[PDB]
Design a binder for this molecule. Structure first.
Ligand code: NA
Ligand code: NA
Ligand code: NA
Ligand code: NA
Ligand code: NA
Ligand code: NA
Ligand SMILES: [Zn+2]
Ligand SMILES: [Zn+2]
Lengths: 305, 305
């Protein structure tokens, strides 16, 4: 038993991280087969970032301007193109450490692991959520750009995120591996605002189920509620509306615990109206929303890779 | 910026995890050079665990009774011995994925990463502390035994922990890689109690420094205090006494922020006497004690591996 915010084992992604330099800008790339993927703002100076014309800036750049280094090994660049906000650098060598992989665009509220990297070298791994407002609350220092988010199924890595930006508010924004930003963000040093950051209700419920399984049951009350009643309280606390799809995803957790989803909603409701009275759930004084129902099921069943 | 509970990248340890079976018991081993390290209770039945004589149980076992499997590859066992609570199985093949490594016995309050494993396969990685009472609050399902804790410096893995037990209280106990338990625990299914679980004061202070660096400063107050005064409040809140060694370790953080250690102690004092009034620090409603000063410095300087 016990319950931890666990990341996926990062080894499969470690083998893919490289260093990309263009003039005096260095950041992280991802080397899969004979293609290196990186933030297009690798071509930018600090001044360029105020108002970049990426097409005009990239037109000054040849294959030989892109210095791609994997460990001590320099890679030969035989082609470059811009897909949305990423550059694809064709190298003459397939990465021999290339895992089975997919590119996927995740939905707000889904979780993934980030391998935080500097100069193509891994520093650490953490689990996080894509916030409903398509920001992530990360740990990214100067040079972390091109660090990637992923999920692992068996032996297959699903890349879902590449770090591009810290907003003036200190939250993190980036792209899928086709270079489309999550949210309305652009790769420009201008004032950009995220929406209201709502709580991922389905994830809070999954975590309350996790708590019951591990013997934290104090918050279980004598009450029930309805979806409409629950959602009236949810809207007031900036919780995402709960849908029947959400109730369905929680079914296996409801089945294991013998607690109906709406009974657990009534629990949540009272926690929202009464707070925690200085009590904790699974060592937290806050309602945790960075575990999906899939994550909670995974950690109780013990899926390996 | 931003601040996350990050684990070390787990790839170097992934390559070392194997499956060890003896009769009907399976758990995780660690394959370094031509030696596999695992919990000695691999030789035990559920009934044996009530009151094992490990010497007498091991005497029934030959090299051929120890089935060691690394991926699909079966390893040939050419020797076995018991060192304290671990078995060392000599195999005829050096692990080609053996990283540079050390065995170290860590001190209460130090942090490390766990690669949670089932049947020699990695499931996830998380960062935790060795509690002052030499327990860890992990996530360990049936079969996680022999999962290991480590730290990484550059390219060297320091193995510090092997999972052996869940206590009846649901906290986790285990050994260094010489098979000496952290704490008074034994590898027997009998009632065992941990001491009072105190808070790691030096780690809470390091994390308050982390918070200031990231612009969470609300808890900074107009007051200062003394080591003796601080420690009188500490003893009352089941905080570890702060020593001058602790003050010295916090020096570089004091230097970066321009906040004297004792001013930060006065901050902590008021948080302890007044709680957080429903406020948060770095997204937590509790004082976090699983970051060392070394961890906080690492995450602000961006050390890679
Ligand atoms: Na970019
Ligand atoms: Na990465
Ligand atoms: Na984004
Ligand atoms: Na043991
Ligand atoms: Na492990
Ligand atoms: Na222990
Ligand atoms: Zn950047
Ligand atoms: Zn065991």
């Amino acid at each position: 038993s016990g319950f931890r915010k666990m990341a996926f084992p990062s080894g499969k992604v470690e083998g893919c991280m490289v260093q990309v330099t263009c003039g005096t800008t260095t950041l992280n790339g991802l080397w899969l087969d004979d293609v290196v993927y990186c933030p297009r703002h690798v071509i930018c100076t600090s001044e360029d970032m105020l108002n970049p014309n990426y097409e005009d800036l990239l037109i000054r750049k040849s294959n030989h301007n892109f210095l791609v280094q994997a460990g001590n090994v320099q890679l030969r660049v035989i082609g470059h193109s811009m897909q949305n906000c990423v550059l694809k650098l064709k190298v003459d060598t397939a990465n021999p450490k290339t895992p089975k992989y997919k590119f996927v665009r995740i939905q707000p509220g889904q979780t993934f692991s980030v391998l935080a990297c500097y100069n193509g070298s891994p520093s650490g791994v953490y689990q996080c959520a894509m916030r409903p407002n398509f920001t992530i609350k990360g740990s990214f220092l100067n040079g972390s750009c091109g660090s990637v988010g992923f999920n692992i199924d068996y032996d297959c890595v699903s890349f879902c995120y590449m770090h591009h930006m810290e907003l003036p508010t200190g939250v993190h924004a980036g792209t899928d591996l086709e270079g489309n930003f999550y949210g309305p963000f652009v790769d420009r040093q201008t004032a950009q605002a995220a929406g209201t950051d709502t709580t991922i209700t389905v994830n809070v419920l999954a975590w309350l189920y996790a708590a019951v399984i591990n013997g934290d049951r104090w918050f279980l009350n004598r009450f029930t509620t309805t979806l409409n009643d629950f959602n009236l309280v949810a809207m007031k606390y900036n919780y995402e509306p709960l849908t029947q799809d959400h109730v369905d995803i929680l079914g296996p957790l409801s089945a294991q615990t013998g607690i109906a989803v709406l009974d657990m909603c009534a629990s949540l409701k009272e926690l929202l109206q009464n707070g925690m009275n200085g009590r904790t759930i699974l060592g937290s004084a806050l309602l945790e929303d960075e575990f999906t129902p899939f994550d909670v099921v995974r950690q109780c069943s013990g899926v390996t890779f």
